């Protein structure tokens, strides 16, 4: 199947029993047994397995070309289950600018269980190699990252991990399985905040994990059954439903990204623009070799906090909110929202100025989105 | 408010905006901000807070006479969040017969993070005192326990915990807040598998935690936001809805329990009957001092595995399934289902014979339930 | 099965395929066919049939001791489908005080299709006989009625209908199948606003119809498939779920009704009290012969509009709202809400004074409900 | 707004109260009133109005450039409400090949209420004029029609209706508001089976109606409130959600239609192909003047029943089922499914041969869909 066909027919999303062309919502906690231990269709207790959740798990496995899928109550729960593959005394390497929620969990929760963490500039793979310790067991990378869209070489990271005996993990949220497939590049585990593009409609919080490794899958299943951060059946259904349109949504988003970037690069009120499609973006070549499309997150700098605040008030179609990947276009200012707890001098050295604006391109008309942002910039 | 009124009007379960008499289902992931950092009603991102989940959290806090409530994707997720209050090097004491899911998580997951566990016969409080170590930080008890309904003195456990500097935790699933309120007896944290009685309809998997301690609540909120085992909005709504009838359901269940036990005690095919209402049950007096009603779980022994298997096939109204607390009556054989991985000789020393049958009394007609089980026993 | 057992095990509310102990929610519109015309489980298109809707239809048929059940998008849709059994030129007799929504549909919609209607005092069965015309085809009665709880003799009405060649219909909303079963008394069709007691939680709008007559059922099915006022699958699920607790809810409501009426009859600020349990209520004897319990709707008179308005502001547990049958107690003033379009002089001749208050007793604690209403009355 | 922007931001689909970027699901039946008759936000009883249903009503009004929208429990319920604008003695003109469900309701239900119907070949507007009677009050047309995609001139029909004093109605299901807007061409009422393209995911049954005429809207609202075929809140939410991707879905469908038709026209096993894009299709010019895109329904003839049956078994990506407009491609044989009750000789004179196959193009990859159908045809 080509990609758009796989989004409709990959995995198991119909009812074998009635023929229903959509996955029934099994709002149930337990299953009758005909004889003790005799499970009619392999279900016994919804925390261990639920048919609607099993459907979305089969879909993400299919879309990432993995064997096993797992659905969690949030992206953070997916990350937590993966980190729980490790033991006290183990060390993990992550990219320097990792999601604030990943950063928080690792430095404030899992350090109390003896997991040690280092945040490394993974855009230079030599810095990965230099950071590996005897106790390192995992390499965890996002690419592209937030909010500056830094790109990390997935295939090289997978090779480094294999050579040094590490479990490799990619957070593939920003690219989605439609454009980037880490498992095909040798990564062990791929994961997503399905809250973003996969659900696509700003109406489900969910995490998804996929792997082809049977032993890691058994370990993940045991962690899931033992710590219980499972996705419910209604959210599993809405996620399956949202994924159906993923290809069309990302293709529209990508058309708009191209034109929006052109407008931003020409606008006199905009300084730097950050997106992996830009020729001068660091590791642009790496991104084009490992992905066949782009994320809809773009960041760009205006002069100062006052210009960013006024830019947002002047748009018609950009919704001021957290999150990304929705059908509606979204806008934020990282220094005031996500990164406000970081001292301003450190933020700036990290490349996040007070005037940095982040947008998540939605599926509105491309000309409307370009013209709306351009006229708002014109007021600065 | 008396208890039945509190189930309807405790907490916040209406919509201030429209006046809707039920909690709207906020199937949403993010919230528009008018100005940066200006939250219209305090919501910014559904993982951190969602109005439907906030509703069920307010209800469980009210019903347990606590200040703060937390809703998780499963009972196991609630337990995991509570255990994560501890650090590597800390020790926890739990009752000897704790739920297999609690047992699994603690011995196979959290031991890998340096949490050490001892399982103690908490029906004698001197055994609790004798087990406390310098590194003990938590005392976790279920009462009554599964499947033999062992009773632990909550008030004495709370006093021991306070004197020895331990966080006390009670799993109150089997009694519900309608009959037993550990926080009022000095316990620090109370938790539930809301999958069971609270939801009540076999159609939600969920965990709930309540506490009056502001600092423990801040620690729990941070763990929840960082590990993300949150309950979704549809499941939160169904849980709120199910809780409305909790008092009526438990009162019907309790009427049937009395008559069923009378019939079991007189039946020649039944040996021991286990339930805290029975006069000869160990710590019967303790149970009646700390609870004003009973659980609907009853266990009783028939001769052997063959008699239990045939008892189940002979009933009309008892559904062979895992779980408990449903409107439908349920039946199981622990030695073949929940405890089958435990060597048979150890099972028996633990008091679980091959002929032990567990029932969860539902809300069917009392005479029907008594007569159905009695005639099935008559076939043995 | 006794009544409480029938509410749990009557009809088909489990999944044969997985063993799920609750009805799956088939949020689907169409069904795969293996061969043309070969329906895997008899489903082809959800408007014609949907498994979740089929579940609630089987339940209402079971509870009313009928053969065929039908689920509609509202009580009004159920009534409309039943009236559509008739042709232009046909006449229908209804009780004099029929629900305003029934009254509206018949006099303003169906009269335009040539259906003629007369509203008769059916509390005297001779007035029914005197109203029958050559073209009369249907006798439609509510008992008890709203808001004065007038009682009509069901068995005599069924006999009159049979002798005169009429289809008999009872709106059984206020009594529910738990206490009154018109089909067992010879009535042809029974119907409900399932929005009220059956759903029970103020969170579903729905209608239900049951009959034992195969030919009327075929006519109803054809009307349903042709005019399409079908109940959706999520609402069908919530209705099935709510019905599980109907017996317990009505028994608690009935205990409170007895005590509330005692308090109202003794209170010096209350004049007449209207409820079929009252010895002096017209056709009290008829009600006790055809029902084995009571409705939770009670009406009572205070002095004037000012006393009713102030009574409502003074209660703690009575919610000012339309509808009835909820777990929360509700209060209204018919002259200001439901009947405000009727000239005040006609309202009074109909027995509805400006001071008439209607309450719907919920499942709060009986003492709380009695004391709350009594102290509010004390302020008058 | 351009069309793709209107699908995201037209109507009201956010929560003013919390800022939630999606419409909350108001699973509720009634609303608290602060003072008698004082509605906090204009809601009193969900049958009369529900905020989630009000959201989808605002969306369809926006997308059709109307003032008022109405949401019904099915397309058939929408049609029934519109027909109920008429009285006994009135006559309606409809296209000769109108949907079997419309045909059934009109000829078997509404004729019993004195509504008279004539089915006219509306592809020649002179046949419309010749059919108008003194009692004609309504002209109802589908364009394109099923299964032969016959095209009727909307603007001319609107002019004829205006001149002759008729209410004009277009069933716009097959084109959707994305490509054809009857209200802008002078039609009085537009309606949809939202079960098809608008929901788009084969998981909601729903009807929608829009109009700009205030008096017709008041009449429709009264009919809706009186006959109660209302869409529930969960289905209203899923419909709003599905509509977000309508533009992207229809654009992908249209790209595939072009290539599929090219392949069908060249295939030696295919005789006639029916679709309005084809140059030789009757009223092709009319269609291109009144629509700016195409439907995804295509019909084409193979030799006989045996070739159609074997064509279907030989495809990989075409699901044998009723309905259309889904993300998955669908296939059917009208003579065996929808039209099997029509004598075969009449079917053929109506242009429906035993070998006529209907497909509904979904959003799978265009090359996959073309190649799959072409190789299946190659087996004939």
UniProtKB/TrEMBL annotation, chains A, B, C, D:
The keyword Protein biosynthesis does not apply. GO terms for cellular component: cytoplasm. GO terms for molecular function: cystathionine gamma-lyase activity; cystathionine gamma-synthase activity; pyridoxal phosphate binding. InterPro entries: Cys/Met-Metab_PyrdxlP-dep_enz, Cys_met_metab_PP, PyrdxlP-dep_Trfase, PyrdxlP-dep_Trfase_major, PyrdxlP-dep_Trfase_small. The modification N6-(pyridoxal phosphate)lysine is found at residue 196. The keyword Zinc does not apply. Its cofactor is pyridoxal 5'-phosphate. Keywords: Pyridoxal phosphate. It comes from the Bacteria. SUPFAM superfamilies: PLP-dependent transferases. GO terms for biological process: cysteine biosynthetic process via cystathionine; methionine biosynthetic process; transsulfuration. Belongs to the trans-sulfuration enzymes family. This is Cystathionine gamma-synthase homolog. It comes from Staphylococcus aureus (strain Mu50 / ATCC 700699).
């Amino acid at each position: 199947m080509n990609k758009k066909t796989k989004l409709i027919h990959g995995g198991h999303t119909t009812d074998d029993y009635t023929g229903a062309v959509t996955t029934p919502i099994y709002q149930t906690s337990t299953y009758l047994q005909d004889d003790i231990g005799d499970l009619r269709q392999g279900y016994e207790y919804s925390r261990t397995a639920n048919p609607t959740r099993s459907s979305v798990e089969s879909v993400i496995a299919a879309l990432e070309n993995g064997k096993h899928g797992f659905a969690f109550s949030s992206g953070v729960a997916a990350i937590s289950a993966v980190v729980m593959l490790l033991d006290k005394g183990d060390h993990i390497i992550l990219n320097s600018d990792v999601y604030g929620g990943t950063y928080r969990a690792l430095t404030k929760v899992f350090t109390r269980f003896g997991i040690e963490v280092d945040f490394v500039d993974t855009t230079h793979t030599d810095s990965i190699v230099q950071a590996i310790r005897p106790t390192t067991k995992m390499l965890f990378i996002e690419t592209p990252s937030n909010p500056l869209l830094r790109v990390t070489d997935i295939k090289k990271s997978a090779e480094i991990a294999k050579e040094h005996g590490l479990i490799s993990v990619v957070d593939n949220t920003f690219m989605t399985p439609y454009y980037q497939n880490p498992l095909d590049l040798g990564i062990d585990i791929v994961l997503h905040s399905a809250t973003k593009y996969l659900g696509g409609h700003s109406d489900v919080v969910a995490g998804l994990v996929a792997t082809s490794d049977d032993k890691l899958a058994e370990r993940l299943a045991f962690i899931s059954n033992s710590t219980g951060g499972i996705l419910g059946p209604q959210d599993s259904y809405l996620l399956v439903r949202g994924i159906k349109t993923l290809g069309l949504r990302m293709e529209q988003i990508n058309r708009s990204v191209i034109e929006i970037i052109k407008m931003l690069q020409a606008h006199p009120a905009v300084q730097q623009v950050f997106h992996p499609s830009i020729e001068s973006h660091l590791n642009h070549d790496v991104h084009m070799a490992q992905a066949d499309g782009h994320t809809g997150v773009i960041a760009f700098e205006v002069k100062n906090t006052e210009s960013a605040k006024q830019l947002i008030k002047a748009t018609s179609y950009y919704t001021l909110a957290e999150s990304l990947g929705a059908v509606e276009s979204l806008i934020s200012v990282p220094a005031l929202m996500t990164h406000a707890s970081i001292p301003a001098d450190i933020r700036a050295k990290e490349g996040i100025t007070d005037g940095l604006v982040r947008i998540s391109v939605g599926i509105e008309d491309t000309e409307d989105l370009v013209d709306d942002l351009k006229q708002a910039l014109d007021t600065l």
